[PDB]
Design a protein around this ligand. Structure first.
Ligand SMILES: *C(=N)[C@H](C[C@@H]1CCNC1=O)NC(=O)[C@H](CC(C)C)NC(=O)[C@@H](NC(=O)C(F)(F)F)C(C)(C)C
Ligand SMILES: *C(=N)[C@H](C[C@@H]1CCNC1=O)NC(=O)[C@H](CC(C)C)NC(=O)[C@@H](NC(=O)C(F)(F)F)C(C)(C)C
Lengths: 288, 298
């Protein structure tokens, strides 16, 4: 039982460099459109973006695709949400079947971290209930995408925008809308309190009992799901189950492990003195 | 600080499928040669391989590369170690600058786990001191490769062969020699006892101090010397520290930024074996050998 990531080859063939008057980041090239963060044209705030994008000369958008050796030429600039839709002359012949899918908190995705239009590293994250990811990005990485795959169909979920001072990262879906109440502005932005995605904590504990001698810190007594949820409301744990569809997986793991979920939940409560606690294992990934 | 995988696009463009009389697995296609495990021609033992390979007809090797729409035709077949080197008529246009490099225990690599010539998952493993990897594989995954990337060159380290009862996996390097004393035969094979790669366990705790909590309450207050630790390590399934002298430059740096000398990390490891009591360190619940000092420091 490993943390599984999706192969990045399809994403690599679409990544492009986007350089606008001394500001460099990444973008993705699908059909005849290149999607990049809008702050490549400057550091603006509020409703200045509409007018500021309209005064942007397309000749200044230097766009290159390193994998294909092509230099793209922009014909029109359209702002959609917090993203820029740059229409180019050439259609990307490497464009796959793709979908723009929003992620619900607690779901996983593969980050294709890129620089200068080239994907450098690939790693795994789960969108937390505070609508932040705990990723890793340096200067010039904006425009990196978080994606999943399902039968050679690219599911784009995320594009990176901003890093906060507690090693948190925020971006948009590919429709241009941020996750949570965060924006692309260099100011302090109040984050909602952290809360554990309980379904995923349950998934990690079951992953441990399946890849190891049942440990000593495993609780000996059961607790009802309802008693856990009254406890969870005062200990920053999400109401269980967070996703009703996860019970098909969780109950299946409870069979393979011969440990009922009621015992796993009481173990979560007793591990409070030790208590980040990590919601990186989803029940789908552990079961399949 | 994350577990970083290398981008797999270079590997996908060269993966192929290899089928022989109903036995199907994966192969990698570099230049004019296709490399795949030898048990695609049968489940033979001992020294039966040299003979059975020389009588295998090349017209029974069905070789497709689905990402390029080509079906390959095999000219010659040569057994190199536990691998078959299938020469084909067509040079691979997507062949990168590559190198066959054998890993030493404690190093990491990215696994491109494929089926029918297409990689379905990528994940990260470390060659353990038993010369096994703790990976994830199903039927038809043989031929999957473990690799790393240094700029432009693709560094091939591993090709998958066999899964053992304890969810451990074994294979060869790209030159054809297995890691450890394991062979491609469906019998029980003795495994050396498990031993933690102490350098990597030190890197995991430092990763926790630098990203999760700078002063966790399981961090030992007192220190132990490297020497006193290594006396304890010989009896507690921990390798002698340091396992690699080149890791010291990374660990000394991690100590300087964490403001916690390695002596306290080593004593923390000793204390955790008697009083971890369910502590979850860098999301792992167990000591992991997945975090290397190089990756955590860089
Ligand atoms: C995109 N090219 C970068 C990605 C950053 C750089 C450092 N790590 C990352 O993930 N994005 C930016 O540089 C941001 C630009 C804004 C206008 C969208 N700026 C930031 O992320 C800054 N963060 C803040 O000011 C904030 F207060 F925390 F929000 C940096 C990280 C530069 C201080
Ligand atoms: C090749 N595609 C597979 C990959 C396996 C299947 C299950 N998980 C894997 O990683 N390799 C095989 O099927 C092996 C073929 C041999 C002849 C090289 N066989 C095995 O791995 C078997 N293992 C054993 O018999 C052994 F005892 F553990 F060594 C299986 C796991 C199928 C029983």
């Amino acid at each position: 039982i490993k943390i599984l990531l999706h192969p990045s080859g399809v994403v690599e063939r679409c990544m492009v460099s986007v350089v606008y008057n001394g500001s460099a980041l990444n973008g993705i090239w699908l059909k005849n459109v290149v999607y990049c963060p809008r702050h490549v044209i400057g550091k603006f705030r509020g409703d200045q973006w509409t007018h500021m994008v309209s005064i942007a000369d397309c000749r200044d958008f230097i766009v290159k695709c390193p994998i294909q050796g092509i230099q793209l030429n922009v014909q029109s600039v359209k702002m959609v949400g917090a993203l820029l839709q740059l229409t180019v002359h050439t259609n990307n012949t490497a464009t796959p079947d793709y979908k723009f899918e929003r992620l619900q908190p607690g779901s996983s995705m593969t980050i294709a971290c890129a620089y200068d239009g080239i994907v450098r590293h690939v790693y795994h994250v789960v969108l937390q209930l505070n609508n932040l990811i705990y990723a890793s990005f340096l200067n010039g990485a904006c425009g990196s995408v978080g994606y999943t795959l399902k039968g050679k169909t690219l599911y784009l979920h995320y594009m990176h925008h901003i890093e906060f001072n507690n090693k948190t990262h925020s971006g948009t879906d590919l429709e241009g809308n941020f996750y949570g109440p965060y924006v692309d502005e260099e100011v302090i932005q109040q984050q909602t309190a952290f809360q554990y995605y309980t379904d995923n904590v349950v998934a990690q504990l079951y992953a441990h009992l399946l890849t190891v001698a049942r440990p000593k810190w495993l609780a000996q007594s059961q607790i009802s799901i309802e008693d856990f949820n009254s406890w969870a409301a005062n200990n920053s744990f999400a109401n269980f189950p967070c996703e009703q569809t996860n019970m098909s997986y969780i109950m299946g793991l409870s069979q393979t492990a011969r440990v009922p979920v009621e015992r796993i939940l009481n173990t979560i409560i007793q591990l409070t003195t030790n208590r980040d606690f990590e919601c990186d294992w989803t029940p789908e990934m552990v079961y399949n």
